[PDB]
Design an enzyme around this catalytic site. Structure first.
Site, mmCIF file in Angstrom:
data_model
loop_
_atom_site.group_PDB
_atom_site.id
_atom_site.type_symbol
_atom_site.label_atom_id
_atom_site.label_comp_id
_atom_site.label_asym_id
_atom_site.label_seq_id
_atom_site.Cartn_x
_atom_site.Cartn_y
_atom_site.Cartn_z
ATOM 1 N N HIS A 1 0.821 -1.203 0.000
ATOM 2 C CA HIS A 1 0.000 0.000 0.000
ATOM 3 C C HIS A 1 0.859 1.259 0.000
ATOM 4 O O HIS A 1 1.888 1.332 0.678
ATOM 5 C CB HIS A 1 -0.981 0.030 1.187
ATOM 6 N N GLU B 1 3.547 5.680 12.374
ATOM 7 C CA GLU B 1 3.774 4.244 12.345
ATOM 8 C C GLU B 1 5.162 3.954 11.798
ATOM 9 O O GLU B 1 5.596 4.573 10.821
ATOM 10 C CB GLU B 1 2.726 3.517 11.493
ATOM 11 N N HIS C 1 0.786 -6.653 11.487
ATOM 12 C CA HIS C 1 -0.478 -6.444 10.797
ATOM 13 C C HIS C 1 -0.887 -7.715 10.063
ATOM 14 O O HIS C 1 -0.077 -8.317 9.350
ATOM 15 C CB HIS C 1 -0.358 -5.293 9.800
ATOM 16 N N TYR D 1 2.503 1.688 16.494
ATOM 17 C CA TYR D 1 1.779 2.953 16.441
ATOM 18 C C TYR D 1 2.184 3.820 17.627
ATOM 19 O O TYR D 1 2.330 3.324 18.747
ATOM 20 C CB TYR D 1 0.266 2.737 16.464
ATOM 21 N N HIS E 1 -2.842 8.041 10.321
ATOM 22 C CA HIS E 1 -1.408 8.063 10.597
ATOM 23 C C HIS E 1 -0.641 8.236 9.297
ATOM 24 O O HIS E 1 -1.155 7.971 8.207
ATOM 25 C CB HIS E 1 -0.936 6.787 11.310
HETATM 26 O O1 LIG Z 1 0.355 -0.113 7.362
HETATM 27 C C1 LIG Z 1 -0.771 -0.892 7.663
HETATM 28 C C2 LIG Z 1 -0.906 -2.172 7.146
HETATM 29 C C3 LIG Z 1 -2.025 -2.930 7.455
HETATM 30 C C4 LIG Z 1 -3.009 -2.409 8.282
HETATM 31 C C5 LIG Z 1 -2.875 -1.129 8.798
HETATM 32 F F1 LIG Z 1 -3.848 -0.619 9.611
HETATM 33 C C6 LIG Z 1 -1.754 -0.373 8.485
HETATM 34 O O2 LIG Z 1 -1.599 0.919 8.998
HETATM 35 CA CA LIG Z 2 4.192 1.499 0.093
HETATM 36 FE FE LIG Z 3 0.019 2.057 8.153
#
Ligand SMILES: Oc1cccc(F)c1O
Ligand SMILES: [Ca+2]
Ligand SMILES: [Fe+3]
Ligand SMILES: Oc1cccc(F)c1O
Ligand SMILES: Oc1cccc(F)c1O
Ligand SMILES: Oc1cccc(F)c1O
Ligand SMILES: [Ca+2]
Ligand SMILES: [Ca+2]
Ligand SMILES: [Ca+2]
Ligand SMILES: [Fe+3]
Ligand SMILES: [Fe+3]
Ligand SMILES: [Fe+3]
Lengths: 314, 314, 314, 314
Positions: free
Chosen positions: B206, B271, B252, B261, B220
């Protein structure tokens, strides 16, 4: 549009039982099919397509071809047109040429290696699934390689005769396939000669790479691991399986990836590669390594270019 | 063509000295300039552009805007045209609107957040250089964050009134900006409602993400670390600096990335994200998380969705 | 001469099937025998004696007794003599009182807990052997705990009534059993009250520990892991097995050991402890933690003493 | 009573500036004093006594003597009596023979090495303190070695002439100094010859070790690191400082400890050792390694005994 990632590598082996034993037990791959000619097809647990490795019976080692996956079927026509405008002749093998594999655009790199592009391969899924998946699967075997990561090809290079297919391959995959150069090793007077290049379509440091040699061949295929710790576990696995090690756990200066080099029972070199290293980006400066620091570019911790890295390949 | 990665985030802070102290000492960023209005600009050691974080004096916390970098200047016109055909109105701030920053295409996401796209930002290089570079630099401070990785935005969501800007943002950045969806959290009857989405332009899980909330805001901003070990070191750093922790070291479920966090002195959440997780790919199935496993999707080790994750933001 | 290490812990459980399932699947222990009364005996892979955990059917949770192994049979008489000169009455249960277990010296600590000392327990070996052994065994299950490491006992403490069995236990095991104090938590006026102590016979930070409480009981038994990475794997295992977590992965300020707290199906608390931390030595200064930093002494990364650490035990 | 741990090692160096530069910048030690003869004294950050390494000007490399610390001054008389009943003659150097060092019992091992025992050395404390200490200190340099861990001595061995000072040293330190044997390498017919032994006073796999050789000398001194990750960082440090590597990062079959071998500027070999490995115990079976697996006992990942491990020492 265009190339997504490395799709599969087809290798020659002289003992199929021993080779399949190696890729299953050491790297943690799974056999997914065997065709009527005795070729064996394997995938890694974190790949979703049918296979990333083909083992073909032979009387020698080496590579048959290298395949990259493209985003959509229509990319094959567009890339075929660009490739042929460049001067490379192509053919289109149709569906089922390889089992569970769509049509493939086939051509030779300037270095002489056969390269194929496909858009369609049978989906089977990762071993963790895609609905509330675990981060890793139970019953993982050996080093538990995530996926086939990249391939380093030895490319015929004779500068005093005007031959450098590392440079020609580098120009080819950039102009025709829209790879971008991430890192290079510069030798010769003032670094005027490209002897090693690393190129990407993903945002990882490399999906294909070329290194100069007296002839063209296969240096290694590489598999991704998460962390430096997994490299330790993988080295422990190779000891338990009496694997022949080429280079013990260390870090690459290029890409920053931690690595182990070792051999399959037929002599083809494999690598377990750890970590992202950095986010490769089209606006990122090309990392340049010079000949005086040529050893640290490959084996960063020692600064000592192994005689096996530059003399042994298939 | 198109978006490369997240470019910078501009945050509101109420104590500039304390905030700059936090991003320098805890995350290891470096201040690169301060404009005539008192805004402070910081970058990470493994970024090559001038800055990825803007701190602006304010009487509250929150986010001013979010910026993504595109490959070339001509992408701005092409993306502007697509964005406006979709129904979103845009403006073009010209060069020097922000110091060391080229012209910027400005628009509001359906959730109301201001988003900017730029092609040009002053190059300054990473702290390791690009000629025979070390894998990491000496004098690294704090957690030694590599780069600004992604941003999770809280998006106004009221399903029983027909409002879900998570879905609208997701459709927007896919159709107009050509992001692709990697993972989603599905709630409501039979998972019929998208409550959280993760989208990429890179091949990481992501580069932007949206989560539903009663109002729109900033959940965040995140910074990349290499390994689970660096997460331990980062947590050690936060203790030494008396940082307020939101969530202690864990993994995660979504993305598989290991995480911490914590809060800056003004209340904005940060984060430290560890690892690639997996190679995001346009042909990869979208990972779906369901409401019954909603806790494991965010905090995988406990399966317990913290009340702070879903109640506290700026 | 004298005590070598913790030998076993005997726990009360209310569901034997679920409890055995927990210690086998989550911690990776193996059942080695079940006696005629339904008690189940388990060992870890890197222990060589028959068992380190006894599960006994009950209608409640808690601990039956705690056992430490001594170097030779003659140590039992010598330690019995010292213990009784101190004012503690002892008994000698003979061979076979527990299956596969030699004679045991039995007595109550000042806090009221039953403690046993044995010299002889049936040898069975580690799961890796002792002739050219692998560093770890194949078929390892769950977190793959190496060995039972230590036990933290809640000890009745009422300072305004002159009761502090933490101090009395600390004086007892030092003067009679020749443990040495490695670390302490000091509360009350100017740190004049010992509320938590950690004591060793090995050169690890602790083999037994005492923490004050309104009553005496069992805080947790702990199992050793090698690295911070194994803590990540263990947390992944607990998620896969729907284990109830007490404290997510973090580091202890005391001992420097990285840790996870969690519960067995009957409510007894377990810990997976990572790393040596430091070499405990009889000439090393006692590490003192004060009440203002009481939170960092237990949960170093947050500085937040969980309400569950000080309220929940069996 | 008795020996606690290795106390210091006194090494010969030919370039003091370069040697001090090495132990400070590569291993992270700190110089604590220099005596009137030009000898330099260094300690590690996680040691509390004045020094663990003495560098003495010389025209060659090698070791002057090896020192172990005992619990109390009265141990020196008791150990002196046992040593002399065994047939070894001793002397007692009084306080201040070495600066900041109490009286020392001096004698030669059967292999000819000088060994000293001391009870008193000036306390200075660790670099993290003992009141609410951090797990590691800021400003840590290089590999950040915790402490001097052990020393491997090459011992004259000529079996066909009846000479095996590895066996004689092993019998000596067990019977007189009450070390216990943890692991051994057995060569010759049916493993009838002890060629390498590892012995402990702590509950770590080894505090002293002996390996056979044509002559007696120093194989290496070793420094403790926490994790496999720190071994990666240490290897990164050696590259940055152009350190000469003997063996790249790998794991020892013996002790299970992960390791790097490298050289100081005078040729003395150093080791960065990672992890506890296992809890050494007097009731633990002695781990036996046989000659056919002799390579895996030292370099587990390759099974290849380096020619440098068995040919190069000082
Ligand atoms: O960076 C992340 C990856 C997976 C879930 C989350 F809530 C995140 O902030
Ligand atoms: Ca990325
Ligand atoms: Fe994140
Ligand atoms: O994967 C690699 C990264 C950097 C250098 C190399 F030689 C590699 O095989
Ligand atoms: O094992 C431990 C180490 C330090 C503090 C604690 F509370 C522990 O359980
Ligand atoms: O520290 C060591 C552990 C095992 C084998 C060796 F050779 C060592 O130096
Ligand atoms: Ca790649
Ligand atoms: Ca212990
Ligand atoms: Ca030791
Ligand atoms: Fe590679
Ligand atoms: Fe504990
Ligand atoms: Fe060693």
């Amino acid at each position: 549009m265009g190339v997504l990632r490395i799709g599969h590598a087809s290798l020659k082996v002289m003992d199929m039982d021993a080779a399949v034993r190696h890729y299953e037990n050491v790297l943690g791959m799974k056999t997914t099919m065997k065709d009527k000619a005795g070729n064996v097809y394997l995938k890694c647990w974190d790949e979703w397509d049918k296979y990333s490795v083909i083992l073909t019976p032979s009387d020698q080692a080496g590579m048959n071809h290298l395949a990259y996956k493209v985003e959509k079927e229509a990319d094959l026509e567009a890339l075929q047109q660009k490739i042929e405008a460049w001067g490379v002749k192509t053919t289109m093998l149709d569906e089922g040429t390889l089992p569970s594999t769509g049509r493939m655009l086939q051509f030779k790199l300037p270095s002489g290696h056969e390269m194929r592009l496909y858009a369609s391969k049978e989906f089977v899924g990762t071993d963790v699934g895609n609905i509330n998946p675990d981060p890793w699967p139970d019953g993982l075997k050996g080093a538990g390689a995530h996926w086939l990561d990249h391939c380093l090809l030895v490319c015929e290079m004779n500068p005093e005769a005007g031959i450098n297919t590392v440079a020609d391959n580098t120009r080819f995959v950039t102009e025709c396939l829209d790879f971008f150069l991430t890192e290079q090793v510069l030798v010769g007077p003032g670094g005027s000669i490209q002897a090693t290049t690393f190129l990407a379509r993903t945002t990882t440091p490399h999906d294909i790479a070329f290194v100069g040699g007296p002839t063209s061949g296969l240096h290694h295929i590489a598999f991704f691991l998460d962390s430096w710790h997994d490299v330790l576990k993988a080295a422990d696995v190779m000891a338990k399986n009496k694997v022949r090690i080429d280079v013990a756990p260390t870090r690459h200066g290029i890409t920053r990836g931690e690595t182990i080099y070792f051999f399959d029972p037929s002599g083809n070199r494999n690598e377990t590669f750890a970590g992202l290293g950095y986010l490769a980006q089209r606006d990122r400066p090309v990392t340049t390594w010079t000949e005086d620091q040529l050893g640290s570019a490959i084996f960063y911790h020692t600064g000592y270019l192994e005689p096996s890295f530059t003399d042994v390949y298939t």
